[PDB]
Each structure stands twice: as C-alpha cells, then as structure tokens.
C-alpha cells in the first residue's frame, strides 16, 4: 500500500536524522574558537572587462588561470584574456537565452546552454580559425542551469527537468542520468578528483552523486528555499550552498551534516553565486544586494566586501591558483578582484 | 610586443562587430507571449506570419521577435527574469473558457485560472514598467456560447444581460482590474479579428505607444 511504504519511508528519514545527531559531537564554531582571524580583506578591482551589451549570467575561469568565458542575453559568448583585458573570441550563439558556461580543462572546448534545452559545445582549436559548434546535446526537457566538463568527451549537465545527466560528446547521448531531485536543479559542482559531484535544486536539498554508478550517495537538507549555487571545498571533503534564505551553509560529505551557516541580519536578498579560496579559508558569495561578500569559512565572520556592481552579481569565480576573483553581474561588466 | 600589438587589433576588430550586432539587436522588438494552453496563442502566431520558440516577422519597417515560452513547463520563478526589458507582454485569453473547466481540477474555471496567471504576471517584480497587450481570442465562439449558456457559471455576481457587447465588456474590465501599477503600465486589450489581419496592426499601434511614451520619459518631456 501507499501508506505502508509512506509510514515506512518517514521512518527511514528518522534513522538518518537519529544517526546525524549522534555524530554531532561539537560545532565547528566551538572548535575554531581560538583560530586567529583572517583580518580585514581589502580586495580592489584590478581589471574591468567591458563588451557585453546585456546582463551576464555565467563565467568560468581557465585551468591556466588567465583566460575566462562569459555569456549574456545579447547572444554572445566571449573568451577574455584577464591579463590584457583584450577579447580572444566572440562566439555568436544560436539562442540568445544562455544561463551557463563551462571552459574545458584542456581549454580546447567551451560549452553553453539555457532555455533552449540544448548544451552547445564549441571547438576552440580549429584549423580554419573560427570557433565552430561541435555538438548539440539535446536530451533535456527543461532549461539547462549548469554544466561542467570532466574531460574533452565527458560533460555533466543539470537542467530544469529535475534531472542531471552525464553526456558523451562524440555520440551525443546521455551516458548516465541522475534522477531523484523533487525540484528544479540549479547548479552542480564537480569534485577535485572528478569522481563525485553535488547538485543543488529548487527543492531546498543538495544531493551527492556518483558519476560512474549514477546513484545518489547522500542528500543534505537544512536550507529553507531554492539552492542557487554550490561549490566543493578544495579537498573535496566539504561543499557550500547558496540559497534564497540569504544563508550559505558548509556541508560535510564524511560526517553527512551541516557545519556552518553564514547569515547576517543585514542581508535579506538571495545568494546567486558562491566560490571558495584556494586554501578554503575564504568563501566568496555573490548576493542580490548588488555587492559580493567574503566570508571567513572557519569563523563565519563577514570579513570583506566587494561592492563594485550596479546590478546583481550573477556569477563569481576564483582562479585555480587563487591569484584573482572575477565577478560578473547584470550591469554587463566583469571585474577582476585581487 | 609585435605579437601583442596584433592581439589588440583583434580585440578592437571584435568590439566593432559586437557594437554593430548590438545596434542591430537594439532595433529588434522583443515581445514576450503567455496565456493558457488553449488560449489561441497558436492561432495568434499563425496570423502574425521544444524549449523557447522564437518567431521573427516584420511590419511597417519594424522587426518583431515573439518569444512563445509556453513549452518550458518548469518553475517560472527562476527563468522569467530573463525576459525583463521586453517591449511588451502579449497575453492571450480564450473568452470561450468561461463555462469550461481544466481536465485535472474539479470545477475551477479555465477563465479564473487565466486571471491567476495574469495577476502574478502584471504584478511581477520584473515587469513593474512593462506594458501588457491583452488579446481575447475566440470572441465569435464566445458569442455562440453566451447566447445559450449564462455567464453566472464563472462570475457569481453579474448585473447585465446575456448580450455579447455587455458580456465581453465585463470580462475586459474584470481583467484590467488585476494590476496595482495602474499609473505605471498600460494594458491594451483587443478582440481577435481573423480575416481583417488587424491583430498584427493592433500590436504595431500598441508597441509604438509604449515606445513613444517611453521616449517622452527619458528626455523629461513628460
């Protein structure tokens, strides 16, 4: 019967919740009480990239920490050179409605997608020197919200159809499909080892997925509204979520609990992007307050603010070497903060 | 450097293509289309000419881009902000949906469901300034429907006869009462005319009014 399984199912949530309390020995805030603070983090706009004629939704750094990508509703995908602020490529999109970007780890490929329900992959290194579109991954039924390359052939995408998928670019078919989210999936983050990835959905939950098996290992709750951004800790043993509850939370994968909440009474708008520092000591979160805060990731004390944007800070990414932090916004400008 | 000097030449050559493309996109008119499944938005699109559907058509040297976003079937709360800065929001409601009901719900009218969608859109924080064109389709089918069936089935309170002229006029004014931004946005309501092809001309006149009124705002002559 439905009630047999339901009265059963609500019990299974109890042992999960019962065991999590038993493993809640002491709060990270108590353990990190005597750590010396990070001090005022004064970070200034070094470079400002101009050339977008609409609001920016997505940006992604390169693995060489110098090039980066950005997409906007103007239907242009631009590859920047952050050092010399000069445009390397300006890719016209078939669909002006683009909500995500990814720059391949090898830098041979770039991918974008949005309301057109397609993940388009553009080839950068092309004999005829004109970025050409390679493949169009059309297997989703809702807007694509995120996409992250594993290799030049594997890309994992999260869509508004409550499902994530792992693709094979050569064949253009979903190698694996991740199901179990009861709300629209907003963002995903890959583990450093590229064996696991966590996804945040509109159902106020984050799920840890396994890329090979295709089954969800753990599910984290605690937020009150949509989860809009997610990133792993550098060591791949923790991750942070940005929600519309104007709180960032640091979850652990081994302890399977929540550690911190980064909430401030002053802040009432929703978090749009989150990202870490190379050491994992700073958690940069791009709010709707038009500004971007920098949190002490082990003290939960707002040490630093990056207020330079007219409109909301849509995307926010840090370099692999951690020498810079770049924030996009709806004001059509990318700013490099160092 | 010799290499770096030639690099900056590209960046300027890129920027000049973006401006030329940006100034081409600025002249284009962006209309967002909404409504119920059976509204007649399909029939409106036919007169004018999965995922998000774009329709391009030209009228009197003006270029229109109509974004039929009916096929998204996901949470509007996450992607409706993408359409902030459209010239107008075309909205289609079928007048012949007053006595009907959705195949899923028991006795909640299709017309009352149209209002619930209209209330959330006209008062959406993203479309505080955006004008709404409101098409009311299937007007001749509504005339046949009202001549035999009463209008009390949908609106419990109604002072007026079963006459097309008065029956329709109540609905139009009933739809126009949903907006609280009365002095910020203008709703241009039209009854669909099949053969005349005036539906596209009404869009022309409604769009220019929103452009002309806006031009008077930013120059201060208003």
């Amino acid at each position, epitope marked *: 019967e439905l009630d047999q399984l339901r009265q059963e199912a609500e019990q299974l949530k109890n042992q999960i919740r019962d065991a999590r309390k038993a493993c809640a020995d002491a709060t990270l805030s108590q353990i990190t009480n005597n750590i010396d603070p990070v001090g005022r983090i004064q970070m200034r706009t070094r470079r400002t990239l101009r050339g977008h004629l609409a609001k920016i939704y997505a940006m992604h750094w390169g693995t060489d920490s110098r090039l980066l990508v950005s997409a906007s509703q103007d239907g242009k995908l631009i590859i920047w050179d952050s050092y010399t602020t000069n445009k390397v490529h300006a890719i016209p999109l078939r669909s002006s409605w683009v909500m995500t970007c990814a720059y391949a780890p090898s830098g041979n490929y770039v991918a974008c997608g949005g309301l057109d329900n397609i993940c388009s992959i553009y080839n950068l290194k092309t*004999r005829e020197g004109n970025v050409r579109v390679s493949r169009e991954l059309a297997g989703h039924t809702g807007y694509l919200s995120c996409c992250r390359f594993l290799d030049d052939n594997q890309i994992v995408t999260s869509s508004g159809d409550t499902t994530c998928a792992l693709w094979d670019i050569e064949t253009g078919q979903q190698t694996t499909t991740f199901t179990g989210h009861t709300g629209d999936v907003m963002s995903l983050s890959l583990a450093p080892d590229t064996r696991l990835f966590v996804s945040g959905a509109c159902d106020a939950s984050a799920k840890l997925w396994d890329v090979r098996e295709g089954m969800c290992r753990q599910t984290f709750t605690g937020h009150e509204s949509d989860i809009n951004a997610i990133c792993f800790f550098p060591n791949g043993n923790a991750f942070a979520t940005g929600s519309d509850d104007a709180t960032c939370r640091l979850f652990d994968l081994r302890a399977d609990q929540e550690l911190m909440t980064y909430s401030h009474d002053n802040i009432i708008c929703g978090i749009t992007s989150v990202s870490f520092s190379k050491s994992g000591r700073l958690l940069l979160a791009g709010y709707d307050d038009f500004n971007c805060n920098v949190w002490d990731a082990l003290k939960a004390d707002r040490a630093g603010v990056l207020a330079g944007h007219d409109n909301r800070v849509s995307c926010l990414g840090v370099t692999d070497d951690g020498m810079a932090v770049a924030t996009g916004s709806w004001d059509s400008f990318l700013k490099i903060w160092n | 450097s010799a290499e770096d000097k*030639a690099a900056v030449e590209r960046s300027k*050559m890129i920027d000049r293509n973006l401006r030329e493309d940006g100034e081409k996109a600025a002249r284009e008119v962006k209309l967002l289309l909404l409504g119920a499944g059976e509204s007649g938005k399909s029939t409106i699109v036919k007169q004018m000419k999965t995922g998000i559907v774009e329709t391009h058509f030209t009228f009197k040297d003006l270029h229109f881009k109509m974004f039929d976003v009916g096929g998204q079937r996901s949470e509007r709360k996450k992607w409706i902000h993408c359409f902030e800065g459209v010239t107008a929001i075309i909205f289609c409601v079928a007048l012949s949906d007053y006595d009907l009901v959705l195949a899923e719900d028991e006795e909640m009218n299709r017309m009352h469901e149209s209002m619930k969608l209209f209330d959330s859109i006209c008062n959406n924080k993203w479309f505080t300034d955006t004008s709404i064109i409101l098409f009311l389709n299937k007007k001749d089918l509504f005339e046949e429907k009202i001549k035999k069936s009463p209008l009390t089935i949908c609106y419990p309170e109604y002072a007026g006869s079963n006459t097309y002229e008065e029956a329709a006029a109540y609905i139009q004014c009933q739809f126009e009462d949903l907006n609280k931004r009365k002095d910020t946005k203008e709703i241009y309501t039209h009854f669909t005319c099949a053969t005349d092809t005036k539906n596209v001309q009404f869009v022309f006149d409604a769009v220019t009014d929103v452009i002309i009124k806006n031009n008077l705002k930013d120059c201060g002559l208003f």
Partner: single-chain antibody
Amino acid sequence: VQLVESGGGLVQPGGSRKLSCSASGFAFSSFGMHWVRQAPEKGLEWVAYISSGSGTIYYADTVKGRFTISRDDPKNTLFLQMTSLRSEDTAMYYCVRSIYYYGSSPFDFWGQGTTLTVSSSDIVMTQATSSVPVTPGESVSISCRSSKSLLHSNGNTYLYWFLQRPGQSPQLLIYRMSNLASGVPDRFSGSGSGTAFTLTISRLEAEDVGVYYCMQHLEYPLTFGAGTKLEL
C-alpha cells in the same frame, strides 16, 4: 585549407607585376597574411604584412615604398602590387597566414608560392651550421643565436622554427620556444633563453631531412636566419 598564389614567371626589369593568392578553405577575413620570399640559392626573407581587416600594413627595408599589398576579403584573395622590379627581387614568393591572439600559432600554414625571375636597429639571427651530416635514429641538435634578447617582459621568447623539406613549402615546427606546432611529431623540441636557442630532434627519419630556419617575431621586419640543411 590550401593556399595557392598566381603570377610570377619572367619579367623584364622595371616592369610592374601583380601577385594574387586565392585563399580557400578557412576564415580568410580574420587572418593576418604575410609574404616571404626565398632567393633561388639563399634563405627566406620577410617582405610584407597585412593585419586583419587591412588595419596595419608593414614592409621590409628593401621593398619599402616599392611594393603595395592589399587583400580582398569577400573574394578570399590576397594581392601584391610590385613596382619597378630590380635584379635582386628574383625569389620564390610564399604567402603565409598568421593569427595573433593569446596562445595562437602564427605562420602555421604556408602557400606553395610562385617563381619570379626578373631578366638581366634590425635584429640579426645567426646560425653557422650548414649541410650537417646526420643518420636516421640518432639525436641531432641545431643551435641558433640572436643579436638581441628575444625574451620579452611578459616572458614570451618570440623565436620561431621552420622546416623546409626539399621541393616543399616551409612548415612550422615551433611557434615559440618550448612549444610544439600542430600536426608535428613529439620528436621536435626547442629549449633556450635570451640570445641562445637550440632545436633537439630525438630520432629522425627520411621524411624530416631538409633545411631548417630560425625566425624572431619580437619586432618587425621579422628577420630570418640562414639555412641549416641536414645531410643524408
């Protein structure tokens, strides 16, 4: 992606002839083109250059004000207008394409060139090795020397390498020191700093025997080096 040029042949001195290079199979409108000439017995020598969209036109010392270079983007052609040819303009005129953006490979593709026989503050690159004997399966190193520190401020040593097999157009091997071109085996490698440069081949074959060239790109007019022919 082939490049073919038209013209050349036999011209009396003082005559004005035109060279047309019809690009086919690539985005010609976004490629900075060059011209490089090779004397019948001597090495390469840069002559001209046009940037993307005809924004920047440069020339060599021997052809300044004598040659006019133009491109026709819609027709995918490149033109060279030569005026009052001298006896020292007898050379095979290759056409080279190059694109400049972060991490690009300029001078990657070379035309077949045309034969032209007229009737009758500059960096100098020096390599004093010629007709060096070598056997297949051995390791050979080719050394180059510059008169100027090619290592720019940003750390880019704008030194290139080329390989011209007998009876073929020159082919890029190394577009900057410690970099490897596209479609060239891993055997070729180059390590150097400032004014000293080397090209190391681990194991070679009958296919890669020929003459090698060294070019700098720190500043115009892109002076080349003398040849370095591998003897086999």
